[PDB]
Amino acid sequence: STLAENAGLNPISTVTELRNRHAQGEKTAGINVRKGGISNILEELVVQPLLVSVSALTLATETVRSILKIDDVVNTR
Amino acid sequence: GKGAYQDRDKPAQIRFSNISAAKAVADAIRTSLGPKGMDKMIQDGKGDVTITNDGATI
Amino acid sequence: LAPVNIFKAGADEERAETARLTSFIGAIAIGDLVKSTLGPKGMDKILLSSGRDASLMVTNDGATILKNIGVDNPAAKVLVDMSRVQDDEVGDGTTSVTVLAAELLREAESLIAKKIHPQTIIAGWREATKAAREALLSSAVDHGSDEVKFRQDLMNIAGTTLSSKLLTHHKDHFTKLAVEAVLRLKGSGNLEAIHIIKKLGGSLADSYLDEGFLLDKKIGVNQPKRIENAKILIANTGMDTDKIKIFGSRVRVDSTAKVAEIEHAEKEKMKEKVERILKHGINCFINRQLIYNYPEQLFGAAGVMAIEHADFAGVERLALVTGGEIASTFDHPELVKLGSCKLIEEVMIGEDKLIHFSGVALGEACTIVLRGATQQILDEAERSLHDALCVLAQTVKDSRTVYGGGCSEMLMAHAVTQLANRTPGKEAVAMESYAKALRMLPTIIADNAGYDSADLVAQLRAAHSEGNTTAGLDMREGTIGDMAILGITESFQVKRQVLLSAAEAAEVILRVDNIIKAAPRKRVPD
Ligand SMILES: Nc1ncnc2c1ncn2[C@@H]1O[C@H](COP(=O)(O)OP(=O)(O)O)[C@@H](O)[C@H]1O
Numbered sequence: 037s038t039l040a041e042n043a044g045l046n047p048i049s050t051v052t053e054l055r056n057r058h059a060q061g062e063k064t065a066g067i068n069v070r071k072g073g074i075s076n077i078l079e080e081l082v083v084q085p086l087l088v089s090v091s092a093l094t095l096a097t098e099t100v101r102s103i104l105k106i107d108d109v110v111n112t113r
Numbered sequence: 114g115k116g117a118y119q120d121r122d123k124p125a126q127i128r129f130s131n132i133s134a135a136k137a138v139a140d141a142i143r144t145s146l147g148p149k150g151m152d153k154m155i156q157d158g159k160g161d162v163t164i165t166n167d168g169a170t171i
Numbered sequence: 172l173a174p175v176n177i178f179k180a181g182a183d184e185e186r187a188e189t190a191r192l193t194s195f196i197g198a199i200a201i202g203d204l205v206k207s208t209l210g211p212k213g214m215d216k217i218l219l220s221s222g223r224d225a226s227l228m229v230t231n232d233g234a235t236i237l238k239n240i241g242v243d244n245p246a247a248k249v250l251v252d253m254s255r256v257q258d259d260e261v262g263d264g265t266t267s268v269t270v271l272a273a274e275l276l277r278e279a280e281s282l283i284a285k286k287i288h289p290q291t292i293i294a295g296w297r298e299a300t301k302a303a304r305e306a307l308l309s310s311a312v313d314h315g316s317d318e319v320k321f322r323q324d325l326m327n328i329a330g331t332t333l334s335s336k337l338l339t340h341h342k343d344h345f346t347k348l349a350v351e352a353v354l355r356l357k358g359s360g361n362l363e364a365i366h367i368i369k370k371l372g373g374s375l376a377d378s379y380l381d382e383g384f385l386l387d388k389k390i391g392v393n394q395p396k397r398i399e400n401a402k403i404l405i406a407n408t409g410m411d412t413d414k415i416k417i418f419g420s421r422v423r424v425d426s427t428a429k430v431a432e433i434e435h436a437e438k439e440k441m442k443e444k445v446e447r448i449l450k451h452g453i454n455c456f457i458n459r460q461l462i463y464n465y466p467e468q469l470f471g472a473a474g475v476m477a478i479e480h481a482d483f484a485g486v487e488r489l490a491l492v493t494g495g496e497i498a499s500t501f502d503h504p505e506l507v508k509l510g511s512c513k514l515i516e517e518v519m520i521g522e523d524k525l526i527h528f529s530g531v532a533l534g535e536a537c538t539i540v541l542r543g544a545t546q547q548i549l550d551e552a553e554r555s556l557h558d559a560l561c562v563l564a565q566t567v568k569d570s571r572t573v574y575g576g577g578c579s580e581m582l583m584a585h586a587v588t589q590l591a592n593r594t595p596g597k598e599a600v601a602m603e604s605y606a607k608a609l610r611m612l613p614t615i616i617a618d619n620a621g622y623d624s625a626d627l628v629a630q631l632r633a634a635h636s637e638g639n640t641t642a643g644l645d646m647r648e649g650t651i652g653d654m655a656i657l658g659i660t661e662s663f664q665v666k667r668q669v670l671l672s673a674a675e676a677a678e679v680i681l682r683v684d685n686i687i688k689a690a691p692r693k694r695v696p697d
């Protein structure tokens with residue numbers, strides 16, 4: 037959604053089309069800012085490592101789980 | 114069920130405050146994501162100026 | 172108030188009623204501050220400092236919470252100190268002791284409201300404490316002759332201790348770190364032999380215990396980066412301008428060539444010392460002080476790895492791990508022992524490089540690498556692993572255990588109630604109150620999980636009254652269960668310390684009848 041908003045695209049329609057295209061087969065669809073729409077992403081040669089996504093998700097989940105454990109704030113010296 | 118009355122509301126208030134602060138930070142840095150995101154300029158209290166797109170630096 | 176003034180300006184005095192009111196308010200406030208962090212489903216506290224440059228931490232430890240707040244009530248300082256010394260003695264039990272003291276004071280206030288002299292309450296509590304400690308002692312189970320039962324008990328103790336802290340997210344994994352590490356000490360209680368290294372990045376489940384040793388140091392330039400079948404000399408000697416010839420001597424000549432000659436002799440002294448060091452037959456040298464760059468090249472030419480600036484702790488830990496001795500004066504190569512290890516190399520963790528020793532000889536000291544996604548997570552993980560190691564070392568020293576989950580408190584309360592039913596007078600009313608305090612620790616635990624505490628405590632009391640001496644709370648479902656089957660096990664020393672310390676602190680506070688304050692030392696504003 038953010039990627040659709042920053043490029044001046046319509047987020048609701050773009051995300052609905054993304055989900056519809058991912059639910060019926062090919063799993064490499066994405067947002068093309070050059071074309072201004074939705075298309076295969078490997079044809080535009082934009083790729084990234086897997087470690088980036090895996091590490092991001094794991095660290096985010098761990099931080100949220102840590103935050104959910106807190107129920108007080110105390111002012112000290 | 115029928116009982117277990119919760120007589121303290123401070124934990125819920127603290128949790129909601131934490132949620133609000135985190136969402137505020139996320140919304141603040143949202144605008145810098147993607148090939149069509151712009152930069153931010155920070156002016157330190159000392160007087161130093163930085164123009165950046167990196168999230169950690171911001 | 173008498174018309175005549177006996178005191179200075181700013182001095183203060185409070186008498187019986189106000190003194191007791193102030194003391195009880197302070198004690199109860201301190202107890203209720205930390206009630207919330209008790210049991211497997213307690214929560215944590217955020218502490219941030221107004222003065223100390225906005226330092227931030229997230230903690231569950233009772234002693235850590237109490238040592239950081241700025242209490243000014245005199246009756247709270249006693250509880251803070253008692254919690255601190257409890258942490259220093261056994262390392263576990265910090266929250267139960269202060270909660271129990273607060274509950275005892277809360278009962279004592281109503282007892283005083285019923286027109287009973289404090290000394291009567293003190294006598295009743297003394298008898299109740301005697302009976303409770305006897306009943307606890309009779310319930311201990313002492314293993315240690317059989318290896319597998321003892322190791323299973325150690326695993327159960329570690330699991331019970333780690334249940335209330337963050338590490339409970341991976342309770343099994345970290346349990347394997349807590350036991351094995353302690354079993355590396357070979358019966359020595361030196362907890363300084365276990366080094367904990369925490370570094371940012373990665374997940375909490377990526378932590379491990381190394382099979383060798385890790386140093387965060389550097390080797391000199393133009394020396395081998397790895398050695399197989401190493402022989403290690405560990406020394407504590409000066410190598411940067413070693414010639415502190417501690418006399419008050421001086422050089423007084425009439426020519427510059429003489430100064431050059433004496434300079435050359437100074438260099439030859441270092442050369443001779445390095446040759447004497449190399450006479451031992453070593454290929455690895457570790458020193459706690461700095462090594463200047465002339466001995467650096469002397470070692471480099473001989474193909475010997477040299478480590479510099481490895482402070483006292485590192486030297487002692489390496490001595491334990493490898494087996495050498497911390498040598499000096501290097502005149503007798505035969506009388507000094509060298510350490511051995513199968514491989515020394517350099518490993519890369521996160522963004523840093525470390526020296527790794529593998530295949531060590533003894534292994535009587537270890538290192539633990541902690542990984543996490545935030546500084547606060549790492550700090551809390553270390554703070555919890557310390558409690559686990561402390562309780563494990565205490566158990567290894569004295570191996571007799573009891574059952575947790577409210578079993579021990581109910582046993583003590585039942586014994587106290589039976590004693591109270593046999594005695595005449597007002598003291599009985601005191602002893603019953605004692606029991607009502609001990610049955611508050613289980614209740615609070617249930618209150619943190621949302622269970623119907625009253626019904627559970629009634630069932631537990633009924634079960635203990637008829638002889639089921641191993642019944643306790645089953646918190647994964649919230650019922651009554653067998654503690655021996657489920658494996659909830661605690662050490663005897665921790666429970667005994669909790670009971671005795673709480674009783675003595677309550678007795679100390681209850682005897683005060685008048686508080687006197689002197690004029691505070693004014694902070695100089697300007
Ligand atoms: N799995 C469990 N089931 C029931 N009770 C538990 C369990 N684990 C720990 N407890 C209880 O929780 C208490 C531990 O308190 P804790 O929150 O760890 O801080 P402290 O040990 O410093 O009081 C013990 O009295 C123990 O009986």
Ligand SMILES: [Mg+2]
Pocket residue numbers: 263264332335
């Ligand atoms: Mg504990």
